Amino acid sequence: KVFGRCELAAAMKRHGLDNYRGYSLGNWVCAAKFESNFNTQATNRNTDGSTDYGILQINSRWWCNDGRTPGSRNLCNIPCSALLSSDITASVNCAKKIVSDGNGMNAWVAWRNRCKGTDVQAWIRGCRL
Catalytic residues: 35, 52
Count Cβ atoms below 10 Å from residue 87 Cβ, excluding itself: 12
Candidates 9-17, 39-47, 98-106, 109-117: pick the segment binding Cl ion (CB under 5 A): 109-117
Q: How far apart are CB 105 and Cl ion at their closest, in Å? A: 13
Candidates 38-46, 66-74, 83-91, 118-126: pick the segment binding Cl ion (CB under 5 A): 118-126
By the 8 A CB rule, do 123 and 5 touch?
A: yes
Q: How far apart are CB 104 and Cl ion at their closest, in Å? A: 15
Candidates 12-20, 46-54, 82-90, 102-110: pick the segment binding Cl ion (CB under 5 A): 102-110
Out of 99, 107, 110, 115, name the contact with Cl ion by CB under 5 A: 110
Count Cβ atoms below 10 Å from residue 59 Cβ, excluding itself: 21
**Roughly what angle, to the nearest 10 degrees, separates helices 5-14 and 25-36?**
120
Out of 46, 93, 113, 118, name the contact with Cl ion by CB under 5 A: 113
Please give the radius of gyration of the chain, using alpha carbons only, rounded to the nearest integer: 14
User: What whole-number distance in Å separates Cα of residue 37 and Cα of residue 70?
Assistant: 29
DSSP string, 5-31: HHHHHHHHHHTT-TTBTTB-HHHHHHH
Out of 26, 33, 35, 56, name the contact with Cl ion by CB under 5 A: 26
Any contact of residue 93 with Cl ion (CB under 5 A)? Answer: no
Residues of this chain that interact with Cl ion (CB under 5 A) are 24, 26, 110, 113, 121
